[PDB]
Write a protein that binds this DNA or RNA. Structure first.
Ligand SMILES: [Zn+2]
Lengths: 241, 97, 59, 182, 99, 50, 91, 124, 174
RNA sequence: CAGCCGCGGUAAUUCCAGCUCCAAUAGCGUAUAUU
């Protein structure tokens, strides 16, 4: 895949995601702000009828755990066009841009980041992408931005902390709708470096079950990542049974 | 091979057609004969089925496709090469020319 | 079949014998042809080929 | 009727407006759909005839097995039904209870006979061709679809002369002779 | 190929009749009319034909190799089935002696 | 015997890649893509049952 | 449109049959069919057919493999039959 | 005991008594007696090598219908035993779980519907 | 003009949606665990986590083997014994003949483990835990559950045999 | 079922190239007894 190479862009099974077919397949998203690259990724220009230029961006699975999961074969991605997503652990916003591309103009991405210096980049990106709201605040205390966030459709959590289960529970009990989706990226080394990764994943899944999130499906992100897991689950406030 | 020497399992090589008989071609063996005989038996079986069907045909059968299909003077079915028509109207012909 | 024998007397002693083809097709010597002398008629279980060789096993 | 809720179904387990136990699974409607039976009472007349056959077979069975009366009457019944065409075989006595069905009689009706004779592509086509006056059984024209064909009478089920169907098939084979009227 | 005699073809039933086209002797107007490009289009036609030929040959090769593999491992599983059946036959008689 | 254990380990290491996805380190060159393709109908996520 | 599929249909064949483009590159088993909706794009940092015909080593490989397939296809057929029957007529 | 027709006549003496209202021979016996005696003989032959579940399977009956039939039959059996105990009359011994065979059993053909005993209590 | 072959409209039991039987009318291949070699579970290491089944406790009491002490002697490493809600519910359903087993299960060295499934079936619950995560060791003496755990690769099995516990399919125990 | 045996040939012939695969390894099998 080089410059000037032709590809055929067709829809993925997931809504808002596309595949560029060629000698090598690519996962792509439709660019909200055409003509710019967030982190120097390859971009694909499609002329569509006067013809107006439409541009797509390549989603790197080594750079984004969500792309690694989609390529590894998740069944249910709750992130969809038009939906409200609460992104926890926004960082510079590389995967946040792709989440914004997936949810599209009608969607809203509440991107919560604690550190101020990646928060500057997140705020600057939010100008070109109007559906991203930067929340420069600790995700461990959701009561601070309760005036800012209301009733999201999905919660994605990419934060790597030992208490991420309590963080996810505290945000889901306030902002997540019932029968909503929770997509969690788990790093066993960041959670507990002593015990093995299978033990870490099992304990985190059990903690979600205690906090009333029902795990639907389980995935390990190889060969893109080592000892990284994605848990997709449903917030059943009524009852898991 | 529990109790067989590897000298017991030597390869016995195949013999060829005689040079005086080389005009007739390759010397068949059982492997060639089986292919020839199987081909003949398959052909004869389907020919027997066709003969039986031709014998047991009912003269009084009627199909709606008899209005479409045609039979030539020899008594065989006419199958159109291009038809799925063949004739062009004068309006089409004028534009094409 | 030709070249097996040299005369109809030689054929007539061996009439009724098993013969076979290098292919493996089995047959029987049936009668001696009048002309030419060494030739004979044989019946096999299948059609044989002009590339075939007919063999008769004796001791 | 809308779909019952869970608490309603428990109080209304027996409720069904479309399937009743007296309908017997709509077996009659199934058989008439299979063999294009137009009259509504034909299945039940056939069923009464099948019931007579099965009642007589049951009585012959309750007779002792080494009874010349029983053996003679069972062979008489098997031969008569086989000659009509209701029974495909004469081998077993038990076919007089197992293989006597309404469908067995309905397979001897004229449109089913024509469809098996390849005269018509469907039984419904055969029905229409019968009512339209194309079919004769011997010299006699039959415009009744309910007419039952015997094994002997199969050999004279043919197209009527001067039939457009007969002219069409002869014209297809290029064997139409207008002296014969086709 | 199979050669059906023309008498049988003449007497075959309507469903069972054989469709056999004749060659055409005369050039039709559409045959004369048809335009065939050259140069780069001819080279593209050559390229596509070679690519499709290689694709079909490769698919056939892979199917034949898979067929050989499944035949061998089916034979192995047949042997395993016989030995397991014999063991279960022995075990049933050994049980029923106790019961 | 050491050489045969070595070649057995190489064979098993080649076979494990066909059995399942194996971490081989992160990408070093630029992202060329998926050299074997992307399937949208196949799901490899192990699903929780009750 | 129909015209769009007509003008790009070879590009959509070289992707359907991409497993027969490089002897060293092998793909996962995908029975790819042309979708009802698609688009043709260009990567920002000449169609696939033109690039592949511009590559000369690939053309040499395609020609060699095609000739081998031709040998396999024509062996044992009518030409063999006629040569075998001519050997009998010659003497 | 090795003799056959004597043991058969003893076993089927109740059916012949019930339905002949002797004609014990197979070339003379007709009707329901013939049908039920053939069924008894065939069931007895099939019992030893047939799995009991596939051999004896009751006719499907609704719960309240079958429970009422069993209750009325048990009332009949208990009444019969009570009179045969008051007027001191010796009766054949019957097993603890199984029902007692009586004339109502043989005439009504109740054994097909309610079975010889209660399989649930027999299992427990 | 009238059509030919006129028939009375009736209920088509094959194709009518109002009837119940007609009213009734992606591929998932799970990934192989990265904890596993071809049959060897390499991620597992002490302290092990042992899912206990009810009959394991009963045979432990019959053979007078301490649970935590016996597991530590069997494995020569520290262990965490886990009793699920369905296992404790099965012990409670066992009745008043098993209150000793109930109390020895209530022992605080055994850590409880919550269940979010309907019913109380320890066999399917433990097998589902096993098929999800490869970090557990299944302690049981049930023949069927033993066969299921033996069919699942990478899962150690503990049993009560003779005087002490015996381990199976754990290469580390020498 | 099997096949070191073929038709010539023993300086005679270069052939399923020495048929392929598996496991332990200075060790590795069999028989019988026994937990
Ligand atoms: Zn449980």
């Amino acid at each position: 895949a080089r410059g000037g190479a032709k590809v055929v862009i067709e829809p993925h099974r997931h809504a808002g995601v596309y595949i560029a077919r060629g000698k090598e397949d690519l996962l792509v998203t439709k660019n909200m702000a055409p003509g710019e690259s967030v982190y120097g990724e390859k971009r694909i220009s499609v002329e569509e009828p006067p013809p107006t230029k439409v541009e797509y961006r390549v989603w790197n699975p080594f750079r984004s755990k969500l792309a690694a999961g989609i390529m590894g074969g998740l069944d249910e991605l709750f992130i969809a066009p038009g939906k409200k997503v609460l992104y926890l652990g926004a960082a510079s916003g590389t995967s946040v841009s792709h989440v914004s591309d997936v949810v599209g103009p009608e969607g809203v991405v509440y991107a919560v980041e604690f550190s101020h210096r990646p928060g500057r980049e997140l705020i600057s990106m939010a100008k070109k992408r109007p559906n991203i709201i930067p929340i420069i605040e600790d995700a461990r205390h959701p009561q601070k931005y309760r005036m800012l966030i209301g009733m999201v459709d999905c919660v994605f959590a990419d934060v790597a902390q030992p208490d991420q289960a309590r963080i996810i529970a505290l945000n889901s009990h306030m902002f997540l709708k019932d029968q909503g989706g929770v997509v969690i990226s788990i790093k066993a080394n960041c959670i507990d470096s002593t015990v093995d990764a299978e033990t870490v994943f099992a304990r985190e899944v059990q903690k979600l079950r205690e906090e009333r999130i029902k795990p639907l499906e389980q995935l390990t992100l190889e060969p893109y990542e080592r000892d990284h897991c994605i848990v997709v689950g449903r917030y059943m406030r009524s009852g898991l049974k | 091979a529990k109790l067989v020497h590897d000298v017991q399992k030597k390869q016995h090589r195949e013999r060829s057609q005689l040079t005086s008989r080389s005009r007739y071609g390759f010397l068949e063996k059982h492997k060639d004969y089986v292919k020839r005989a199987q081909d003949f038996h398959r052909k004869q079986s389907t020919l027997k089925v066709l003969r039986e069907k031709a014998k047991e045909r009912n003269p009084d059968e009627y199909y709606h496709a008899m209005h479409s299909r045609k039979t030539d003077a020899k008594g065989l079915l006419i199958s159109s090469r291009h038809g799925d028509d063949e004739s062009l109207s004068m309006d089409q012909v004028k534009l094409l020319k | 079949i030709k070249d097996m024998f040299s005369s109809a007397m030689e054929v007539a002693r061996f009439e009724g014998a098993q013969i076979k083809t290098v292919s493996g097709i089995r047959g029987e010597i049936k009668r001696a042809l009048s002309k030419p002398e060494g030739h004979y008629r044989a019946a096999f279980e299948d059609k044989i080929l002009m590339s075939d060789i007919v063999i008769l096993r004796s001791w | 009727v809308r779909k019952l809720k869970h608490h309603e179904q428990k109080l209304l387990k027996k409720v069904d407006f479309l399937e009743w136990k007296q309908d017997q699974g709509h077996r009659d409607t199934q058989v008439m759909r299979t063999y294009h039976i137009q009259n509504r009472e034909d299945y039940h007349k056939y069923n009464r005839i099948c019931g007579d056959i099965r009642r007589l077979a049951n009585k012959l069975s309750l007779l002792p097995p080494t009874d010349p009366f029983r053996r003679k009457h069972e062979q008489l019944l098997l031969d008569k039904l086989y000659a009509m065409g209701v029974l495909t075989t004469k081998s077993k006595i038990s076919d007089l209870e197992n293989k006597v069905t309404v469908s067995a009689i309905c397979r001897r009706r004229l449109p089913v006979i024509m469809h098996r004779l390849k005269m018509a592509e469907t039984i419904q086509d055969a029905v229409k061709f019968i009512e339209q006056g194309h079919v004769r059984v011997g010299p006699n024209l039959i415009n009744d679809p309910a007419y039952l064909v015997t094994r002997n009478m199969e050999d004279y089920v043919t197209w009527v002369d001067n039939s457009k169907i007969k002219k069409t098939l002869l014209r297809y084979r290029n064997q139409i002779d207008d002296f014969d009227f086709s | 190929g199979l050669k059906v005699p023309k008498a049988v073809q003449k007497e075959l039933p309507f469903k069972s009749q054989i469709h056999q086209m004749k060659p055409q002797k005369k050039k039709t107007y559409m045959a004369k009319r048809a335009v065939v490009l050259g140069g780069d289009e001819k080279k593209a036609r050559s390229f596509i034909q070679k690519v499709l030929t290689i694709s079909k040959a490769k698919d056939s090769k892979r199917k034949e190799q898979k067929a050989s593999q499944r035949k061998e491992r089916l034979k192995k599983l047949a042997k395993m089935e016989e030995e397991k059946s014999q063991r279960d036959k022995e075990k049933k008689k050994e049980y029923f002696a106790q019961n | 015997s050491r050489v045969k254990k070595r070649k057995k380990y190489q064979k098993a290491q080649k076979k494990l890649k066909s059995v399942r996805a194996v971490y081989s380190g992160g990408q070093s060159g630029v992202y060329e893509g998926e050299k074997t393709g992307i399937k949208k109908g196949l799901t490899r996520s192990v699903k929780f049952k009750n | 449109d129909d015209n769009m599929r007509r003008e790009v249909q070879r590009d959509l064949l070289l992707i359907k049959h991409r497993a027969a483009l490089d002897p060293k590159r092998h793909y996962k088993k995908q029975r790819w069919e042309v979708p009802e909706r698609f688009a043709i794009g260009t990567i920002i940092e000449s169609t696939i057919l033109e690039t592949l015909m511009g590559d000369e080593a690939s053309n040499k490989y395609f020609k060699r493999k095609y000739n081998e397939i031709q040998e396999k296809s024509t062996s044992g057929r009518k030409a063999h039959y006629k040569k075998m029957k001519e050997m009998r007529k010659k003497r | 005991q090795n003799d056959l027709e004597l043991q058969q006549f003893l076993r089927e003496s109740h059916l012949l008594s019930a339905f002949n209202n002797i004609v014990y021979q197979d070339d003379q016996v007709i009707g329901k007696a013939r049908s039920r005696t053939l069924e008894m003989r065939l069931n007895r032959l099939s019992r030893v090598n047939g799995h009991q579940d596939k051999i004896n399977k009751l006719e499907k009956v609704p719960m309240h219908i079958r429970r009422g039939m069993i209750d009325k039959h048990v009332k009949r059996i208990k009444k019969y035993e009570q009179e045969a105990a008051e007027g001191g009359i010796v009766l054949s011994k019957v097993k603890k779980g199984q029902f007692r065979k009586i004339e109502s059993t043989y005439k009504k053909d109740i054994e097909r519907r309610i079975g010889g005993s209660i399989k649930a209590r027999d299992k427990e | 003009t009238r059509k030919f072959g006129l028939v009375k409209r009736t209920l088509n039991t094959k194709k009518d949606q109002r009837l119940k039987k007609n009213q009734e009318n992606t591929r998932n291949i799970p990934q192989v665990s990265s904890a596993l070699f071809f049959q060897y579970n390499q991620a597992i290491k002490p302290p092990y986590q042992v899912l206990i089944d009810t009959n394991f406790i009963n045979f432990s009491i019959q053979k007078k083997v301490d649970i935590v002490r016996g597991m530590m002697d069997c494995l020569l490493a520290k262990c965490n014994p886990l009793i699920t809600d369905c296992v404790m519910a099965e012990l409670e359903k066992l009745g008043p003949k098993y209150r000793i087993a109930l109390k020895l299960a209530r022992d605080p060295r055994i850590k409880r483990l919550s269940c979010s499934h309907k019913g109380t079936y320890a066999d399917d619950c433990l097998v589902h835990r096993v098929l999800q995560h490869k970090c557990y060791i299944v302690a049981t003496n049930d023949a069927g559950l033993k066969q299921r755990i033996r069919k699942i690769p990478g899962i150690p099995l503990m049993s009560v045999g003779g005087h002490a516990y015996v381990i199976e399919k754990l290469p580390d125990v020498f």
